[PDB]
Amino acid sequence: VMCSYNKVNGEYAAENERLLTGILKQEWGHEGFVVSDWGAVNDRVKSLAAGLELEMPHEGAGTKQIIEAVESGQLAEEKLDLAVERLLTVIFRSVDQHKEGAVYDPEAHHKL
Amino acid sequence: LIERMGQALGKECQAENVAVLLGPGANIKRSPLCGRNFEYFSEDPYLSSEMAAHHIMGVQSQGVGTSLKHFAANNQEYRRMTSDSVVNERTLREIYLTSFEGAVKKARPWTVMCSYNKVNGEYAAENERLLTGILKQEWGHEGFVVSDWGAVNDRVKSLAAGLELEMPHEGAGTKQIIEAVESGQLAEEKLDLAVERLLTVIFRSVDQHKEGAVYDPEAHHKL
Amino acid sequence: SEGFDRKHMRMPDNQIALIEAVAAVQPNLVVVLCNGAPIEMPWLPQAKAVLEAYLGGQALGGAIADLLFGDANPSGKLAETFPVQLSDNPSFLNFPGEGDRVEYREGLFVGY
Amino acid sequence: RDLKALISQMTLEEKASLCTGRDTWHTQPIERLGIPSVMMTDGPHGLRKQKAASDHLGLFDSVPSTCFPSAVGVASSWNRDLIERMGQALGKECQAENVAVLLGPGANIKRSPLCGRNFEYFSEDPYLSSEMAAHHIMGVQSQGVGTSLKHFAANNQEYRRMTSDSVVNERTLREIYLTSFEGAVKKARPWTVMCSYNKVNGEYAAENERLLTGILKQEWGHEGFVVSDWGAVNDRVKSLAAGLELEMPHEGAGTKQIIEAVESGQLAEEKLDLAVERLLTVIFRSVDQHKEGAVYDPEAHHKLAREIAAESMVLLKNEDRILPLKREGTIAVIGELAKVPRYQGSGSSQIKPTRLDDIVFELAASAGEHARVTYTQGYDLKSDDINAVLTEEALQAAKEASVAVLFAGLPKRYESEGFDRKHMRMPDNQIALIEAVAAVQPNLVVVLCNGAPIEMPWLPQAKAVLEAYLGGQALGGAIADLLFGDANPSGKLAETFPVQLSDNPSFLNFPGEGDRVEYREGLFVGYRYYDKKQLRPLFPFGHGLSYTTFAYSNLSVDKKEILDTETLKVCVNVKNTGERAGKEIVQLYVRDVESSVIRPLKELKGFDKVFLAPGEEKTLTFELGKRSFAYYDPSIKDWMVETGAFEILIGRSSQDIVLAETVMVRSTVSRKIVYHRNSTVADLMLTEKGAAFAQKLRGMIPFGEEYAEMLEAFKESVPLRGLISFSAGRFTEEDLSKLLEYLNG
Amino acid sequence: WMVETGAFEILIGRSSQDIVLAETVMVRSTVSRKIVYHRNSTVADLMLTEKGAAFAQKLRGMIPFGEYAEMLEAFKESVPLRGLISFSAGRFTEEDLSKLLEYLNG
Asked: After which residues does chain C show a gap where C to N exceeds 2.5 Å?
């Protein structure tokens, strides 16, 4: 599920813990992970703590922040451990389900 | 003998309008050099547990509460607020926790105070296995847990673990508890349960308070 | 005191020496000790008697007078072991540890 | 030979079949491709070639061979070159018996005095052990014969050895146990290393991939292959994947297992190919290096064995100059161990000798016709009960003599592979004979024949005590020469001799709880423990006496300060201030003066032995380096020097320092300090940003000498998050958050 | 908390060093833990059940090398079940032990 650019009731979706964790993960039982719209993150560490696993597009400063939040004792490393497990789960799935040699009929999809 | 001493102390708390007396301490004497050995009872978990329990009985006979103190392995002072006690389960159960077990069970101190250290990589004020699993569930402690002064590391994590009272007053911890409820991270019924433990002890000390209490400084010097 | 541990287990030096000299001119020597925890006693051969009085509180005066003249009979027994030297005790190899970490390696073999 | 070509011509089965033996002592040949068979054979200190017996326990007789002294006493020689010559004799005997690889030496650390196999291990100290082990290997392999550095793991007790779990923390395992093996693998390059029966931290040695590949193959660069102890493997495919090339003895099921694993795509065939290559490289080596027609002089090895022995015995005590004996008067030799000699162990290291000395005959010989040697038996090695007839005969003999030499020790049945001693005492009826013989003849010399330490409550009534250990097939002439002074005693204990069993560090955790033993004493093994605790031993590590005296002089170091990447030269002068020539042993220790981690007070870090005529003086030279000063640091997974002063200590023992000097070693590793929510107010003074806030602080805290002590103690050790509780609301979680940014950028 | 069926000694002293009177009693546990066999159980562990000591016979004989008396007993008692594979002359295999572990655990 992709989060939006806007705030909901004064909090950016990409860091709205009640929205991504409280309602989406806990209440509804979403098993996958949350990705941002492109450039949507305001603070990476705030976003990780709230339930956003993947920042898009690549922003390398966010990686230096997550490391320092762990080492400075402001982010528990098991929050990060939990997040890597959700991400790695979807990535390995699509690998394993990829069909090598796949082709498709441009003629028929024009019919479809 | 110690049970009569605790009664005198209880008579001194009634005359000074003292609700709860922070004590006794019952940590185990692991090393001879520990600074606070003078205010601990013994190296042996049985003798310790006995004296501690009868201390609690005498104080509490007069309707005054106690805070059986430094629940964990606060066995050295050096770097106590950041030190990690690495204790295996047999040693921890047979030795350190057993100095506390007899006293909690027979004497029923109204409160237990946790210590500044970690036990096995978790701060006492937030070790749910220690404050809930062993103190509340296994031993059936009915009162509440209060932190040593400034010992809390995270207020919300400590509430989830079984620590009801943060001392001294830290107002940020209150705004954090409120925000944990609203964001769906802490159930409000965890908090309701906490208020019920706290209010139960407080109304007790009020209802058992003896107005007009005095005491004979002459005889306590005899005692 | 609260807030720090002792660095050694000895009595002050100018005291041990006075015990030794007074003993050399008066063998009939009684020693009373005021302390909260165990100490080494290299002088013990020259004291005929040793009353361990610990921290006897605001009425220690009358109590020690009673014990010394027999109006009370002494009836106390050590509740901790008194080692010969500091290095004998079980915690010596792991106390106070390496920084913020101390390993209770002696196990159940604490004290006596 | 182009080995990758040979392996490519092999079928899948032929490859997998090389991976286990053919029988109990030979490897699998492949006749179609000309791969020969070669023979393994036991013997850390002598050949145990078994003609026709599938026996890994030394229960069946074998071909008779030279029985050199056992590790315990040869290690007491402190003679790196002496043991290297022995390895040459052993290599000449393997060449004559067509023995490809000689299974040994063993170099496990002596954690407990009670371990059964201590008689065939070298020391409690990792440095001395690695030296003797390395020079053992070098001498053997100079003759083109392979070795099997033995029991790679922590095989430190025999009880339940095939199921026991050695629980060792990472620092202890690197600094103590694995370091006795490390030096020898690196300098001597033994062709094979044998794994142990036990688990290490919950994984059987024979499949502890981190141990066999991570440490032995990858880090240390062992080029040869790993062979299992006999029967040690738990799963062959697990063992192959982990770095064990040869299962012994032959187990054919594992070959069908290796085959089916490649076919199921669960073991990559290139892991198997690499394995055939390691084995074939050692096998072709011993073939190419075999010297056909090999012989050897059994006459001369008995010479070599008499020499090793007289350097491998520790004179423990000698009052009133009772030793060396005078060739006059009458000498009363007492005790059945003087007629039924104790000179080796039992188990897979038991040799069938080629000759064997008569101790009384040799004493008679050395005495000359100006002295009478008598013999009385005295006690009963097959009993624990006093004998009233022997005791009257011994007393009567000793009453007639000027001096009495009483042989005592430990019967053969006390020390063996497969079980540990139950106590540390000598037999009872021996202790009694010492006391009574003493009561009628105070001039009493005692010789002990034993593989490991014992208690000596009788020690006051012996004027002299020669620790002769297990001196081998020539211990007769050896003890005769020492006792008469034709050789000078020159040995020093390589293990500590405690007063009582309960003094030693393994006592609270030996042998454990079932299949689990926790090495809880950590780094405090042997003398490292007795030094730290100030627990006086019966005799300390490195203790030995001589019939001459030695003065030490002129400690000096070429540089007074080195970086941890640099090397250092130590020099000391030894002079014989006595009137008999002799050889002297010099021990060099290092003392880290201040360290942020727990360390022993001293660690032995070099040694040499030196022969001096009366009045002669020489100069011995040591070299120190990074490993002379470093402790092991699991966080960076490497060795670490801490910038400071270390003290260099030259002694005749671990108790007796005679000379010291301080040097300054400086680390080349700069670690970035990283602040966090529980760093102390004192941690701020490591950076100039941090001490800036430190002053602005400790005032934001609101609260006379009497309590001066603890107000400093409070303020320096409070964590940064702890200021939140004592700043009158002025320091919040948001501030600490901003502070942690500044501190970390 | 766990009691082990056996003898315990009651000791009356003036100190921890000075015992003046003693007496022995027998405490008997009421807890039976089922023994569970596995591939590294010892030949001695087989003697906790009547099924196990049944197979225990001749299995110690199957060791083909069955003064050195002390250590040969120590060997035979302490070998794990899987260790017999190495010293039974091909007569005890992984499938045999596999069948043995089913029987022992039922």
From this structure: none
**In a 3-state reduction of DSSP, which class is residue B61?**
helix
D66-81 in b/e burial notation, b at 16+ Cβ within 10 A?
bbbbbbbbbbbbbbbe
Q: Give the integer Cα–Cα distance in Å for C38 and C41.
A: 10
Give the separation between CA B41 and CA B27, rounded to whole angstroms: 8
Which residues of chain A have a CB within 8 Å of the CB of D675? 72
Q: Which residue stretches of D311-387 are H helix?
A: 359-367
Letter string b/e over residues A58-92, b meaning 16 or more CB atoms within 10 A of that residue's CB: eeeebeebbebbbebbbbeeeebeebeebeeeeee
Q: Are D128 and D78 in contact (CB under 8 A)?
A: yes
Enumerate the H helices of B115-185 as residue ranges.
Answer: 128, 155-161, 171-182
Please name every residue paired with D317 in a beta bridge, in sequence order, or none if there are none: D465
Decide if C35 contacts C58 (C-beta within 8 A). Answer: no
CB C86 within 8 A of CB C105: no
Judged by a CB distance cut-off of 8 A, whether residue C75 touches chain B is no
The Cα-based distances of E96 to A99, E56, E90 in angstroms read 44, 14, 11
Tell me how crowded residue D232 is: count the other CB atoms within 10 A of its CB.
26
Find chain B residues with C-beta within 8 A of D717's C-beta: 78-82
D563: β partners? D666
Catalytic residues of B: 148
CA atoms within 13 A on the CB side of D32: 8
Joined together, the tokens standing for residue B73 give: 């392995």
Going by DSSP bridges, is the β-strand pair B84-86/B118-119 parallel, antiparallel, or unpaired? Answer: parallel
Which residue from D minimizes the CA distance to E41? Answer: D163
B140 and chain D: CB distance < 8 Å anywhere?
A: no
**Does E contact A via 3+ CB–CB distances below 8 Å?**
no
Report which of A38, A42, A44, A34 is spatially closest to residue A11, judged by C-alpha positions. A42
Answer whether B168 touches D (CB < 8 Å). yes
Torsion angle in degrees (nearest 10) through CA of D714, D716, D720, D724: 30
Q: Confirm or reject contact between E86 and chain D (CB < 8 A).
A: yes
Distance from CA of D724 to the nearest CA of B (A): 8
Q: Does D356 touch chain A (CB under 8 A)?
A: no
Residues 39-58 of E with CB under 8 A from D: 39-40, 42
Rg (CA), chain A: 17
How many whole angstroms separate alpha carbon D652 and alpha carbon D674?
Answer: 46
Breaks (C-N over 2.5 A) in chain D follow: 703
**Contact across the interface for D413 and E70, Cβ inside 8 Å:** yes
C93 part of contact set with chain B, CB < 8 Å: no
Neighbouring C-beta atoms of residue B217, cutoff 10 Å: 8
CB-CB under 8 Å, B171 with D718: no
Q: In the PDB record, what is the listed experimental method?
A: X-ray
D197: closest CA among E74, B152, B122?
Answer: E74
Residue in chain C lying closest to D524 (CA) = C93
Q: Which of D229, D40, D45 is nearest to D120 (CA)?
A: D45
In this structure, what DSSP letter does residue B169 have?
-
Tally: H helices and E strands in chain C: 2, 3
Q: Resolution of the deposited coordinates, in angstroms?
A: 2.8
Tokens of D641: 């020097």
Give me the residues paired with residue D466 across strands: D315, D447
Contact between C102 and B85 using a beta-carbon 8 Å cutoff: yes
Q: Which of D508, D520, D710 sits opposite C1 (nearest CB)?
A: D710
Q: D715: which chain C residues are within 8 Å (Cβ-Cβ)? A: none
Number of helices (H) and strands (E) in chain E: give both, helices first: 3, 2
Give the span between the Cα atoms of B82 and B153, in whole angstroms: 10
Cβ contact B102:B95 at 8 Å: no
Q: What angle do CA D674, D678, D682 make, to 5 degrees?
A: 75
